[PDB]
Motif scaffolding. Structure first.
Motif: not given
Length: 265
Positions: A141-142, A211-222, A247-250
């Motif tokens: 999940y990400e 980042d330049k788009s305001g984005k951050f986060g990650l995938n690889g949640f269990a 939050f939840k990795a949803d």
């Protein structure tokens, strides 16, 4: 004295696809699958375990010497020359038996079952022996966040965050071997980079940065049931920190607002 080259190829398929077995004399390109890089194997010499009592052998590599270790390359492969004969526990020469044990699966994949074989094995036209352990893709999940200026609603670059869990530990990403990595701005592709999620003291945590788009986060949640908290630890000058964000990795994306700091006359 002679050896055989065993070529191990690790292919990943779609979650609902179970590849058919291929014999050691078949060179298989993996049609429909991705070669998996960075998967660690140990090859045990189980000749002595096996010949102690062949009919009772069931894959024990207890006290077996390590014949080799390897890691799959960009073609999902590792190749190892293995002596076709080896000694049993009493020092008698026997047909060699080797056990392949996966020690470090790729992120997003289940570990494969141990398997073993006797040499010499049936080889392909090129003289190599091909084995294809099965790696079942797992669901991971990400989570994505987008930092914005609460007033203008425009995306906001450079805000730094940490992520904590319910135990008050904080997320630190490592490489497949547990070593530190330098994590940049934006969404972090843990799966593509074969990273690991670990939970450490706050001062050792990984900082994620919009980042330049305001984005951050990650995938690889269990899982997608565990609640984490995104905590703004580096606030762009002229802004007030956002409230912590549970939050939840949803697999969703959601906004995190930074209010411009007020200046009174």
């Amino acid at each position: 004295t002679t050896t055989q080259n065993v070529v191990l190829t690790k292919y990943g398929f779609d979650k609902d696809v179970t590849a058919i077995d291929r014999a050691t004399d078949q060179i298989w390109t993996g049609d429909g699958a991705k070669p998996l890089q960075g998967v660690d194997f140990t090859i045990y010499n189980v000749t002595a375990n096996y010949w102690a009592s062949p009919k009772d052998y069931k894959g024990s590599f207890d006290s077996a010497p390590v014949a080799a270790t390897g890691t799959t390359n960009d073609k999902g492969q590792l190749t190892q020359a293995l002596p076709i004969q080896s000694k049993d526990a009493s020092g008698k020469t026997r047909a060699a038996v080797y056990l392949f044990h996966e020690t470090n699966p790729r992120a997003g994949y289940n570990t494969s079952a141990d398997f073993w074989l006797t040499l010499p094995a049936k080889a392909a036209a090129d003289g190599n022996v091909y084995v294809y352990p099965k790696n079942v893709q797992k669901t991971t999940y990400e989570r994505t966040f987008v930092k914005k200026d609460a007033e203008t609603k425009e995306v906001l670059e450079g805000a730094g965050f940490k992520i904590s869990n319910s135990d008050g530990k904080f997320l630190k990403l490592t490489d497949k071997d547990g070593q530190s990595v330098s994590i940049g701005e934006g969404f972090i592709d843990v799966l593509a980079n074969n990273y690991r999620l670990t939970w450490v003291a706050e001062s050792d945590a990984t900082v994620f940065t919009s980042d330049k788009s305001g984005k951050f986060g990650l995938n690889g949640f269990a899982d997608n049931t565990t609640t984490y908290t995104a905590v703004e630890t580096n606030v762009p000058d002229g802004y007030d920190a956002a409230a912590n964000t549970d939050f939840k990795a949803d697999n969703s994306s959601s906004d995190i607002l930074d209010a411009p700091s007020g200046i009174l006359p």
